[model samples]
Target: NSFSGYLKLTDNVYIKNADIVEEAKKVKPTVVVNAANVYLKHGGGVAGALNKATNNAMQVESDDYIATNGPLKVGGSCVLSGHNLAKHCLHVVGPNVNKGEDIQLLKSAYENFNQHEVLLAPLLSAGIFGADPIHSLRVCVDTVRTNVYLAVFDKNLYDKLVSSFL
Candidate 1:
């Protein structure tokens, strides 16, 4: 199916890797989270992960909503149904690294969404946005996200992340 990226994310709540989608295949994630701009552009980072996995179909669907529903705030989020994947996806406007909100907006995203069966999230602000990876991971990790969550990758998987929190 077109849903390869979310394969492993479904089973484990805590994971981090460069190949999130395929690593995601180990299980079957029900919801993929996209950290994006107010425009809901799934162009890069975790958002890009979901976009590529779904054959760019989500961008087309998101465009319609951007026009109708309008843009979302940094803490805001919206849902889109599963396409080729066996799950649905949520788009969240993360804190602008420059704004230094760090885990500010995303804390809520995870806090609320943690209620879902499983979630796939990228370490926010640890990319082209230029926030310190350690800092970013620390912030989210500090929040103590629960149930089951997967990161594209992390510094210490078991010792620092999984065992400590999951």
Candidate 2:
């Protein structure tokens, strides 16, 4: 039902409003994307939910990733083992608009996930990171060639994204 009211951006890309953490529970092996900080901190927002759903194993693996590979830069990503319902989580750091970063960094984050066969992603940088929702949606629309499920938490954002495709 979550996918029912979605806008079909392409043959494989769909945008809709859903709680990404809840959606992730049903799609086995569909790598869920996490809106992470460069340090891979699962403090709040999408990152917090992901860490909680996996019973803290996600955070532990993320900590290990950072320990081994160092901090991920803006638009950089790393995969972490997912427990519970998620099989894998692709953690990426989007540009923090509050810090005067360019929108291209957000685009880069989405581009990095294209290598994955299936992804459930949020509006990167559009939440606490402070990127414009429309611009973030634009970046996702232009990129994301693989099968992607775009999940928006807000009704307004969902409508705006849907309207763009109309």
Candidate 3:
């Protein structure tokens, strides 16, 4: 079945696409999954929105992590709380945007998933500007193909992402 902005892998397992409400639903549960195709434009904007929404929902303090890549801003972090009441709020950040840190972050997140089982990821775009979503999806899908974890996206976004991966 098609999910509005979230994909339900199973009864308890849900993957958020671009919908904040869907992601919020998992807050009450033990583990909520979030995945995304991030870019400077789309990914960053989505991250900013998720960060704000998660913060507003939980009404708790969120932490921030920052990193530098030469002259460019490379990394960031965002976290929020939910009904399940985990460690903190949702965690949001850019995965090695320009410095080729996406793989490292992806690996780290995957490793953490072994322990957490449910980890949310919002991807940052890989320098796609004028190109169509398909072109941008290719960049994101190619970047994360090695990871075994399921990647979720909006229907249209998923189409482009799949095309890019294939």
Candidate 4:
């Protein structure tokens, strides 16, 4: 993937990649959270380090938080709201796999952000779909750009974005 221009939201927050775990560790209080699934076909396992960092920063039990997935599945077809093995789980259907259906779901997730300002997301199908991670990052960013706060992994994925506002 290639590097795109910076997406400056405030003066500080912008799109770039270093490390999610390290970034999360610096947070003072509550922190917005999001992730990208790596190893497309393999269910891109959770970033344990990032999760640990977030948990440490908040000083709360990790169980209080919620983590969501993009469209693809890892082990099998998992439900978002089912069991509580980890924190909170929200399973999102993204475009690429289920184009029409997933887009609608993405729209719904975007709209729902008004209720909750902080969100965690994965690059829906970038690496997994045989498409560049940049495309997947763009879709995830575009879906929630106006309404949601997102933190993404894989700088390579984000680099492919062309500014929507411009």
Candidate 5:
């Protein structure tokens, strides 16, 4: 359970077996990427945890954003000011493969990582959204080119990514 070493995929991208929220809370001006839904609901998983960490302020921000801009579509993202856990949160709606959403859309979502100095991203769409972990992680590694700290929370995903690390 002590897989703390970084598995570098490139000079700027590295993978780590760590808690996404816990590790993000330690950095200043960090942008934590949340694997969000179309409605930007912070009800469960990463979104809920982030909202809770921010004392529900994140949800309030999301509510306002949606009220003004309408529901987010897959592959689109919106940034919000976060609280103690992070300085900002990039909410991106990954495609849900279980409902026949295209895998390419998930890649499109991860591709929205530019314009930031550092990012902490989780394995998007691989959880309740039902994407293949290998495919999702592959798309993430392939698309994100910024200085990214890819956080892996599940043991199986950590192991798989370690084996597949390039």
Candidate 6:
């Protein structure tokens, strides 16, 4: 298949892979989950898209978090609204491979961010910042996985996620 294998977390929940933005248009999920850093700059990766899609939606939210308090730790998140594809964006801090414990890092964030609502998430820690796509899937499901999309940015990795979690 051109895309990857996908499945339902519940009768109304689904987890699959696709270009995050394109799929968001189709799903119109209320929450768009992006793998974030303590900085939550929304500078690159899915964060970049979120930054572009709205009015500093994440940056301001993130800035407030950092200003009043400090960097959002791993597995922590904040919500922002006013975006075209999604009503709210959950900026979540996934495990930082650079920080180590590569395999065990993600599930905590998933568990923390789990809203049991329709969410579109992109593959985290599997790109400029994370780990390898195929390997990351096992790490994801084994550690933990998602209402949120758990979306895939790379076309090649679409089904790789589906089969791993299926």
The local distance difference test score of each candidate is 0.61, 0.81, 0.37, 0.36, 0.81, 0.65
The sequence of per-residue lDDT tens digits that candidate 4 reaches over residues 1-166 is 1223335644222454444333333432132333222122222333344334434332122223223343343311222221112233333333344332343333443333334334333444443334345544444455554323334555544444534312
Better of 1 and 4 by TM-score: 1
Task: Give all TM-scores, in the order shown.
Answer: 0.71, 0.91, 0.43, 0.43, 0.90, 0.75
RMSD of each: 5.1, 2.1, 7.8, 9.0, 3.0, 4.3
lDDT of 3 by residue, 1-166 (tens): 2223444433333334444434444443343333223221213444445445554443222221222221112232233344332334334233543545544454333333344434444333332212334433333344433221233446566655555444
Candidate 1: residue 142 lDDT (0-100): 54
lDDT by residue for model 1 (53-135), tens: 87889899999989999998776788886566537766766677676665566566445455565565666656755665555
Angstrom error at residue 128, model 1: 2.5
Cα displacement (angstroms), candidate 3, residue 147, comes to 13
Clashing pairs in 6: 4-158, 4-159, 119-149, 121-149, 121-151, 125-130, 125-131
Expressed as tens digits, the lDDT of each residue in 32-146 for candidate 6 is: 7777888878787777876776657657767876788777877677776637767777777777676584556666766654564456677666676657766655544554434
lDDT of 6: 0.65
Name model 1 segments beyond 4 Å from true: 1-13, 99-103, 153-166
Q: What is the lDDT of candidate 1?
A: 0.61
User: What does candidate 1 score on TM?
Assistant: 0.71
For model 5, residues 56-91, the per-residue Cα lDDT tens digits are 888888999999999988998988886777778889
How high is the lDDT of residue 55 in model 6? Answer: 55
Per-residue alpha-carbon lDDT of model 2 for 1-166, expressed as tens digits? 2234556877877887888877777665558889999998899988898888888888888888889989998988988776775677788889998988777788789888888977888889988899888888778778877888888888887887778666
